[model samples]
Target: GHAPAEKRSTTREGRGTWYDTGLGACGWNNVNSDTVIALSPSVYSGGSHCGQTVTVTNVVTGAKATGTVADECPGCGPNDIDMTPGLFQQLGSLDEGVLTVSWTL
Candidate 1:
């Protein structure tokens, strides 16, 4: 007999914030120009997704980009993700601080 499947959305919607990149939990030295993201601990999953690409889309402007998972954000909410300046600029402005976005891992 089969059990119920644990289903989740392929695309997740949440808050996006930008940050200065540096030595990350993924063991890489990332710079502000790199397309990288820091996942909330809930999503960080003990760094399981490290180095994986996440496709993110800005909800308001429809802009989209892909970033590699390179760090962890302890202050981030369960659905929140922190991005590098480069990745953030692709979807929104740095001055905005935060943007609403949908992403797929």
Candidate 2:
């Protein structure tokens, strides 16, 4: 049998709890719809990466991009952090939906 499903949250650092839909929601009314994405630490530097270059990859299309870790995604699901609007676009088409990403951890 599979392991118990984990609950995911969507809040960014400095930002408050994120809702699922509607205006004001972190992802809602935004460019990225409701799809959740994962993030990996970039290997450019050694210290805690806040602006470190991160590589984002789309699990569905195999598309990828190199961006920086703008901020911390608080309340987000496990394996997930958060990306800025610019970074999100660089990874893949926001219209596509759900992207699984990995970096040079």
Candidate 3:
């Protein structure tokens, strides 16, 4: 399965973690909906990034997953983007609570 990475964004450095569904700035309210992420302020570019999708990759493990931007991570670092459990699994093992990653929009 190969997807062309057109418009590859500058690699963003961050840590990834899975979390339960919480209120999203974009009005995302589903816990079992599409795999999505909550981008940090800098990563979102102050755009909220709702409905926008990104491909997240774990640089250390070479694992990857695609998710939509649904919320904001105010306390995160400049690049941190917390993810849903399902989406996180797609990138790294569940046993690994947090994984180092990079992403492209």
| Top-lDDT candidate index | 1
Better candidate by lDDT, 1 or 3: 1
TM-score of 1: 0.84
Clashing pairs in 2: 9-75, 9-76
lDDT of 2 at 75: 49
Query: For residues 12-83, what per-residue lDDT tens digits would candidate 1 score against the true structure?
Result: 788989988988877778899999888876343534556667899999899999888888877877578798
- Residue 68 in candidate 2, Cα distance off native in Å: 0.8
Sort the predicted structures by TM-score, highest score first: 1, 3, 2
lDDT of 3 by residue, 1-105 (tens): 443333446667678777775666577865734588877763435453556788888998788778887876677775566777788888887688778878775
lDDT value, residue 64 of candidate 2: 64
RMSD of each: 4.6, 12.8, 7.1
lDDT value, candidate 1, whole model: 0.81
Whichever of 2 and 3 has more TM-score, that candidate is: 3
Q: Which candidate number would show the highest TM-score if scored against the true structure?
A: 1
Candidate 1 regions exceeding 4 Å error are: 1-9, 42-46
- The models' CA-based lDDT, in order, is 0.81, 0.40, 0.71
